[PDB]
């Protein structure tokens, strides 16, 4: 009586995805620049690619895109510094070889 | 097929992402089919985009068809601009075609007598050495 | 396809280990498939890695595909850099291709007009003797 | 009743391996160096290859 109404509503959208994942998990793949304004390209810990640009956001801390270079991308993030909500001016570099804990 | 100058750096990204990124920069509104291809790597400097695009197509990627407002696309390496000060770009075409053979890589001739190459660094290096070497007998006027 | 300069010495090691080692040195994050190949021996000096890699592929090993952040790789000899001070590297290509025949060994042309060879010492020695010998008629300006 | 739950948990990890074998048994195969920092490659008495670098054990 519910299957015989053969009904599926496919996934193709954003999950609203990167605002569900932390900013230091995200890795800068590439940058595009031309007449349509500069845009950064960034990789999830789930291996998805995204495209974001100045005034847009990413990450659980709502990291706002403020600058875009060729090697790196400055963003403004939202951290709880000792109990205060404060700005964190992070700069996501491109992906080389690197390791941390 | 004319645009602002750009530098395309794509390290292991979906061609669909490069495409959207290219639409977010006012290089048309670009839309793919659904499953066009996959992921590619390119790194360009000083290339107008509409070219870096034609050049992206030849890498792995697709061909482009434009409706007018929207364009549909359906199923490091580097780019460097060579100035040709002395010779005509078309006179190089015989020799440059002859390095490529059945390889990858390409050469594009812009109207202002500049050559543009996408390829692996090793095929770029060869093409530059020949273009400059033939340019150099042309400077002795 | 650009990196810090390195010396690769691998005495009877899994290409998967050489790969990981190459990721631990910030030469991307490299990941193989599972069963790529086996074990190889190489010994390089003064070679940027991204080249010592292309060169490792040709030995026994795999081809490389990059996603961007990660790269997937799927299924003594030495390397020496030859400076070419006088001639263009591409003019050597005819003669150098002609020694290789259906052998192993390769030659890579870097943009700064240097040749790089991987091979057995005996094929390296031949390639150096020819490159230097042809360079030497070019120094008499 | 335990086999019919057809269940295997494959080996692919480190066994935590080299901290179970003595240091004079281990043989240096190779060294890699580049922008990702220098890394040594070493061989077990069991013939496995490993990769280890400054600050590791």
Count CB-CB contacts under 10 A for residue D2: 6
Q: Which two tokens stand for residue C97?
A: 């291709």
Q: How far apart are CA C141 and CA A25, in angstroms?
A: 58
Q: How far apart are CA A96 and CA A73, in angstroms?
A: 15
* Distance of residue C86 Cα from the nearest chain B Cα, in angstroms: 13
Query: Residue C59 — φ and ψ, nearest 5°?
Result: -60, -65
3-state secondary structure of B129: helix
Interhelix angle B121-137/B89-100, nearest 10 degrees: 140
List the one residue out of B25, B33, B28 whose CA is nearest residue B8.
Answer: B25
Long-range contacts of C120-127 (CB under 8 A, 24+ apart): C120/C77, C121/C76, C121/C77, C121/C78, C123/C99, C124/C78, C124/C79, C124/C80, C126/C99, C127/C82, C127/C96, C127/C99
Q: Taking CB atoms and an 8 Å limit, are A29 and B11 in contact across chains? A: yes
Q: How far apart are CA C28 and CA C64, in angstroms?
A: 12
List the one residue out of A92, A31, C68 whose CA is nearest residue B45.
Answer: A31
B49 close to A (CB below 8 A): yes
Residues 13-72 of A with CB under 8 A from B: 29-39, 41, 43, 49-51, 53, 70
Q: Taking CB atoms and an 8 Å limit, are D31 and C9 in contact across chains? A: yes
Q: H or E segment at B78?
A: strand B77-83
List the one residue out of C86, C26, B15 whose CA is nearest residue A99.
Answer: C26
Q: How far apart are CA B18 and CA A50, in angstroms?
A: 10
User: What number of CA atoms fall less than 13 Å from residue D41's CA on the CB side?
Assistant: 28
Please provide the DSSP assignment of chain C as one string. Answer: ----EE--EEEEEEHHHHHHHHHHTTS-EEEE-SS---EEEEEESSEEHHHHHHHHHHHT--EEEE-SSEEEEE--EEEEEEE-SSS-HHHHHHHHHHHHTT-S-EEEEETTTEEEEEEEHHHHHHHHHHHHHHHHHTT--
Cα B71–Cα B76–Cα B82 angle in degrees, nearest 5:
75
Tell me if B126 sits within 8 A of B104, measured CB to CB: no
Q: How far apart are CA C18 and CA C31, in angstroms?
A: 11
* Chains with at least 3 CB pairs less than 8 angstroms from chain B: A, C
Pairing, β D39-43 against β D27-32: antiparallel
Q: Which two tokens stand for residue A95?
A: 């992906």
Query: What letter does residue D25 receive in the DSSP assignment?
Result: G
User: What number of CA atoms fall less than 13 Å from residue B92's CA on the CB side?
Assistant: 30
E-only strand ranges, A27-88? 27-32, 39-43, 49-53, 57-58, 63-65, 72-81, 84-88
Distances (CA, A) of B52 to B64, B130, C126: 13, 22, 40
* Distance of residue D1 Cα from the nearest chain C Cα, in angstroms: 33
Of C2, C67, C89, the CB nearest to B39: C67
* Distance of residue A36 Cα from the nearest chain B Cα, in angstroms: 2
List the one residue out of A52, A50, A48, A43 whose CA is nearest residue A24.
Answer: A43
* Distance of residue A42 Cα from the nearest chain B Cα, in angstroms: 9
List the one residue out of A66, D34, A60, C111 whose CA is nearest residue B117.
Answer: C111
Assess whether chains B and D touch, using the rule of 3 or more C-beta pairs within 8 angstroms: no
């Amino acid at each position: 009586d519910e299957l015989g109404p053969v009904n599926a509503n496919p996934v193709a959208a954003c999950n609203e995805p990167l605002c569900s994942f932390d900013l230091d998990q995200l890795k800068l793949v590439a940058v595009v620049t031309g007449d349509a304004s500069p845009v950064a390209m960034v990789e999830d810990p789930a291996g998805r690619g995204h495209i974001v640009r100045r005034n847009t956001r990413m990450g659980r801390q709502g990291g706002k895109v403020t600058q875009i270079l060729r090697d790196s991308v400055t963003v403004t993030e939202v951290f709880s510094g000792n109990g205060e909500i404060i700005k964190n001016p992070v700069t996501l570099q491109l992906k080389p070889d690197a390791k941390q804990d | 097929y004319r645009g602002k100058r750009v530098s395309f750096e794509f390290k292991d990204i979906d061609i669909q992402n490069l495409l959207r990124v290219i639409a977010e920069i006012s290089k048309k509104n670009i839309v793919v089919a659904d499953d066009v291809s996959g992921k590619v790597t390119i790194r360009l400097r000083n290339v107008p985009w509409d070219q870096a695009l034609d050049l992206v197509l030849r890498t792995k990627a697709l061909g482009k068809e434009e409706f007018g407002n929207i364009i549909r696309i359906a199923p490091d390496l580097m780019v460097n601009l060579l100035p040709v000060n002395y010779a005509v770009a078309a006179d190089m075409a015989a020799r440059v075609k002859d390095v490529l053979s059945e390889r990858g890589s390409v050469t594009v001739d812009q109207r202002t007598n500049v050559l543009i190459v996408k390829d692996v660094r090793s095929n770029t290096e060869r093409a530059r050495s020949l273009v400059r070497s033939l340019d150099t007998q042309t400077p002795q006027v």
